[PDB]
Amino acid sequence: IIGGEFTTIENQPWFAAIYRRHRGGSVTYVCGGSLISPCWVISATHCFIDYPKKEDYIVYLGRSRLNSNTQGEMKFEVENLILHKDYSADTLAHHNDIALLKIRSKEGRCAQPSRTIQTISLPSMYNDPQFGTSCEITGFGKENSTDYLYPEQLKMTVVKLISHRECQQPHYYGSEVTTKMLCAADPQWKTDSCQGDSGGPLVCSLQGRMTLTGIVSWGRGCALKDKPGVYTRVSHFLPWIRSHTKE
């Protein structure tokens, strides 16, 4: 997250931190995610496409820091890693960038709700916030494009939803952005998500209810003028989500 402010997991209880176990013994951060049900986390496919082995991932809930423990945090293994079969990456656009991770603790249980661990509501069929609406994003991603390290504390910021018409303009992204994607940015181009925030949530207050509206996916650079962040439009993937989370 470029700009914005540091926050705690108490303010983003649905946030999931995903790490990968390494061939030696070290563990590195991969992407963010969101808890949509006690046993399910939703993230982005581009985060796992190159290493589709479920056994190498670890999911933390109730965690506020990157490399240190947080009181009340819970560790989970990945029981099933579901990637979207139609995922593809073009020059800029990442299509169908969405994934599901079924989690389970060593005792074989799912997440237990608490003050620091809660689920986030999914949207209704094709029911998205009006363009110009303020939404929030959270993540452990880069604070500056020139950084090679991630911040130790979780961050969050607020951006505004941009219409498909505006985002489709020549100086923006042209035809690369589709109706299955959502653009959001700071009107001053000062704050934005960046590398490392992938898979994280774009949450919007819809009818007094916090809703998972988008998933951090792609963008040209970070916080660049006329180059908004592009998010996977969750409302267009409800059928895919329902079919893969049943049994």
Contacts (Cβ under 8 Å, ≥6 apart) of 78: 54, 55, 57, 58, 59, 101, 102, 103
User: Binding to ligand SI1 by residue 197, rule CB under 6 A?
Assistant: yes
User: Binding to ligand SI1 by residue 46, rule CB under 6 A?
Assistant: yes
Find the part of the chain contacting ligand SI1 (CB under 6 A) among 88-96, 103-111, 126-134, 236-244: 88-96
* Smaller CB separation from ligand SI1, 73 or 166: 166
CB-CB contact of 1 with 36 (8 Å): no
Contacts (Cβ under 8 Å, ≥6 apart) of 190: 2, 3, 223
Task: Pick one of 198, 211, 213, 235: the residue that binds ligand SI1 (CB under 6 A).
Answer: 198
Distance of CA 29 to the CA centre of its chain: 13
User: Binding to ligand SI1 by residue 193, rule CB under 6 A?
Assistant: yes
User: Binding to ligand SI1 by residue 30, rule CB under 6 A?
Assistant: no
User: Binding to ligand SI1 by residue 201, rule CB under 6 A?
Assistant: no
Closest CA to 204 of 159, 155, 165: 159
Q: Is 165 exposed, middle or buried (0-12, 13-18, 19+ CB in 10 A)?
A: exposed
* Smaller CB separation from ligand SI1, 159 or 241: 159
Contacts (Cβ under 8 Å, ≥6 apart) of 114: 62, 72
User: Binding to ligand SI1 by residue 237, rule CB under 6 A?
Assistant: no
User: Binding to ligand SI1 by residue 92, rule CB under 6 A?
Assistant: yes
CB-CB contact of 64 with 154 (8 Å): yes
| Rounded distance between C-alpha atoms, residue 96 and residue 236, angstroms | 10
Task: Pick one of 38, 221, 225, 242: the residue that binds ligand SI1 (CB under 6 A).
Answer: 221
User: Binding to ligand SI1 by residue 49, rule CB under 6 A?
Assistant: no
In the structure, how many helices (H) and strands (E) does the chain have?
Answer: 2, 15
Find the part of the chain contacting ligand SI1 (CB under 6 A) among 21-29, 72-80, 86-94, 106-114: 86-94
Distance of closest approach, residue 30 Cβ to ligand SI1, in angstroms: 12
Binding string to ligand SI1 for residues 124 to 153, with x set by CB under 6 A, is what? ---------------------x--------
* Smaller CB separation from ligand SI1, 136 or 197: 197
* Smaller CB separation from ligand SI1, 1 or 111: 1
Please give the residue ranges that form the binding site for ligand SI1 (CB under 6 A).
46, 89, 92, 94, 145, 192-195, 197-198, 216, 218-222, 229
